[PDB]
Amino acid sequence: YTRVVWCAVGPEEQKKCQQWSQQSGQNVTCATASTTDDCIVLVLKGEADALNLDGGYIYTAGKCGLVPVLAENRKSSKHSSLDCVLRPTEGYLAVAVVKKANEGLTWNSLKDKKSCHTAVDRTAGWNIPMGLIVNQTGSCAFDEFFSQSCAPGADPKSRLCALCAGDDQGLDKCVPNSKEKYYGYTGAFRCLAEDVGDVAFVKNDTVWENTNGESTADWAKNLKREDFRLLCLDGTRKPVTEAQSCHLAVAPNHAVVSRSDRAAHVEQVLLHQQALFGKNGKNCPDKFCLFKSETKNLLFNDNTECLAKLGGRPTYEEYLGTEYVTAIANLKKCSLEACAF
Ligand SMILES: *[C@@H]1O[C@H](CO)[C@@H](O[C@@H]2O[C@H](CO)[C@@H](O[C@@H]3O[C@H](CO)[C@@H](O)[C@H](O)[C@@H]3O)[C@H](O)[C@H]2NC(C)=O)[C@H](O)[C@H]1NC(C)=O
Ligand SMILES: *[C@@H]1O[C@H](CO)[C@@H](O[C@@H]2O[C@H](CO)[C@@H](O)[C@H](O)[C@H]2NC(C)=O)[C@H](O)[C@H]1NC(C)=O
Ligand SMILES: *[C@@H]1O[C@H](CO)[C@@H](O[C@@H]2O[C@H](CO)[C@@H](O)[C@H](O)[C@H]2NC(C)=O)[C@H](O)[C@H]1NC(C)=O
Ligand SMILES: CC(C)Cc1ccc([C@H](C)C(=O)O)cc1
Ligand SMILES: [Fe+3]
Ligand SMILES: [Zn+2]
Ligand SMILES: [Zn+2]
């Protein structure tokens, strides 16, 4: 059935998509929206087929009837010569990161500091750290906990957007797409590295990928792992090598979602597209790589080894788990079941 329309979020994902579209022979084409929620509406209307989503957005989409199709999978220590496509996903570690030089900042003294978040509604950037903090303060006024924030996706006039920079020209401040300089895993870690915020809520991988030479980006060239600490829930501070034992939670991997009636077809095309543009793919290193965009995580995370079949044919609830779903239900109370569209 066998053409797929991919939904790109913002102009740089559009660029990368049009490139993929060309190389694929128009087997994949591109719709673009300004936000993930908008791409979710395109999918429901049937005007696009699929896009890859963080867990907090798999929640939104799943209430509207969309279904997990294929999950991002990275380099697992355990689970050895099992083919990547069939290997269970591990999850990723959500962490809070601070500068070592900012002595005496711990989980217990976050109040009134400056924070950097991936975007409103994302797992490691928003849902986990704010669900914890609402639980802890027994208060729904998360908008008043940090003194200033960059939380792309909140009111550009509020203090939740005060730290956001916008694009090259200072436009589009606090849009939840990669035009916002501090958007996403990479933008929130940048927000911290340049000392705009005191704390970044990212995942474990982000600190490694942008330190000790792994990046090459001008802001990240000189960043050293030993210059950062993770904040643990018991009040302590650990080197970034201790994430197994100092994280806020383990997150379900980003996954491709589609409308249930398109799922089989979307799944077939993507297995064949990764055969060509994935890690060992026929055409990757030389014509086109799907999982590469210079640390920008465009369409897919740059560390993705493959897209993996699911097994258990899970619903979105089962995919996310009862642990994670009740956390979001509870947090959403502050802002009991319906498609928000
Ligand atoms: C913030 O606090 C709320 C309220 O405590 C957390 O939601 C609550 O989560 C618990 C445990 O995950 C749910 O209870 C039960 O857990 C046992 C353990 O296996 C299980 O056997 C039961 O099936 C049940 O799920 C409980 O429903 C839920 N409570 C309410 C009133 O909603 C939430 O996890 C916390 N937020 C974060 C992000 O930490
Ligand atoms: C565009 O899509 C079609 C359908 O998948 C591809 O044409 C098929 O290629 C497969 C695998 O190489 C063959 O075994 C089929 O017999 C072909 N026929 C069909 C189903 O039409 C084509 O490979 C795709 N093009 C690119 C460059 O990605
Ligand atoms: C935190 O993230 C880093 C970055 O992904 C993980 O380290 C990588 O681990 C794989 C094998 O598991 C190695 O092949 C890579 O060379 C490592 N990458 C880098 C950039 O150093 C690390 O394992 C994660 N830590 C935990 C505890 O999950
Ligand atoms: C660790 C992460 C990748 C996911 C994860 C955790 C639990 C479950 C089951 C269905 C559940 O917790 O309800 C599924 C997936
Ligand atoms: Fe995420
Ligand atoms: Zn844990
Ligand atoms: Zn099931």
Side-chain angles (χ1 to χ4, degrees), residues 311-315 318-319:
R313 285 265 193 263
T315 72
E318 293 174 307
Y319 178 78

Side-chain angles (χ1 to χ4, degrees), residues 27-262:
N27 280 343
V28 167
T29 57
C30 304
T32 308
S34 289
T35 66
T36 302
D37 287 336
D38 275 4
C39 266
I40 291 149
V41 165
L42 295 177
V43 180
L44 283 168
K45 294 197 267 156
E47 302 186 2
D49 291 316
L51 73 156
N52 188 39
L53 294 179
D54 171 86
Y57 304 131
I58 294 169
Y59 181 90
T60 296
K63 302 231 143 172
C64 297
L66 307 197
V67 299
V69 170
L70 284 184
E72 293 185 352
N73 220 11
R74 1 86 90 176
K75 40 206 95 303
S76 33
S77 54
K78 227 192 197 187
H79 284 116
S80 184
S81 280
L82 231 199
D83 203 50
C84 182
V85 195
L86 294 162
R87 202 206 302 142
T89 64
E90 255 156 51
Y92 57 88
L93 304 182
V95 300
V97 193
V98 299
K99 234 71 184 295
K100 177 183 133 192
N102 206 322
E103 292 175 22
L105 181 58
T106 62
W107 186 260
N108 300 322
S109 58
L110 225 52
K111 215 203 169 321
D112 273 13
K113 298 317 182 306
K114 294 179 266 152
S115 59
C116 307
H117 307 261
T118 55
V120 162
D121 286 348
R122 294 186 46 168
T123 311
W126 190 260
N127 295 344
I128 291 315
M130 296 291 115
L132 291 173
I133 291 156
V134 167
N135 277 16
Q136 275 156 18
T137 71
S139 168
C140 275
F142 57 75
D143 55 312
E144 262 159 4
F145 187 77
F146 298 96
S147 55
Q148 283 181 118
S149 295
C150 178
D155 186 359
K157 297 167 329 271
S158 75
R159 86 231 227 118
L160 284 169
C161 286
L163 268 34
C164 299
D167 68 5
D168 283 343
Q169 307 211 47
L171 297 170
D172 257 345
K173 178 212 153 82
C174 213
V175 297
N177 71 46
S178 72
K179 287 200 74 223
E180 162 61 54
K181 186 195 225 191
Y182 304 125
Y183 174 77
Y185 292 116
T186 301
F189 188 62
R190 189 180 175 163
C191 172
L192 165 83
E194 293 183 341
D195 291 307
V196 186
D198 301 301
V199 59
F201 293 109
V202 297
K203 58 164 166 176
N204 159 70
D205 309 85
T206 314
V207 177
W208 303 66
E209 288 165 14
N210 307 282
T211 57
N212 281 58
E214 298 284 310
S215 171
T216 66
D218 46 55
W219 63 269
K221 254 202 253 165
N222 282 308
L223 305 168
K224 202 298 146 190
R225 264 154 224 169
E226 248 301 296
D227 286 351
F228 299 92
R229 293 286 177 266
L230 312 168
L231 309 184
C232 320
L233 293 178
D234 59 12
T236 51
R237 285 154 63 96
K238 276 149 169 212
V240 305
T241 51
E242 263 22 67
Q244 284 237 53
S245 72
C246 179
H247 51 259
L248 313 189
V250 357
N253 284 8
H254 299 207
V256 177
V257 298
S258 72
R259 231 171 62 173
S260 37
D261 55 309
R262 301 296 288 151

Side-chain angles (χ1 to χ4, degrees), residues 4-33 273 277 287-290 292-293 298-300:
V4 158
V5 179
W6 194 262
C7 196
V9 177
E12 305 185 307
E13 273 199 351
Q14 188 185 39
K15 174 97 61 93
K16 187 176 153 175
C17 191
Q18 273 169 353
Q19 256 180 50
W20 179 20
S21 177
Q22 180 168 51
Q23 293 297 295
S24 75
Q26 311 289 78
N27 280 343
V28 167
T29 57
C30 304
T32 308
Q273 292 293 316
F277 314 102
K287 291 198 96 180
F288 183 75
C289 300
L290 249 192
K292 263 80 194 177
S293 57
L298 292 179
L299 303 181
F300 298 95

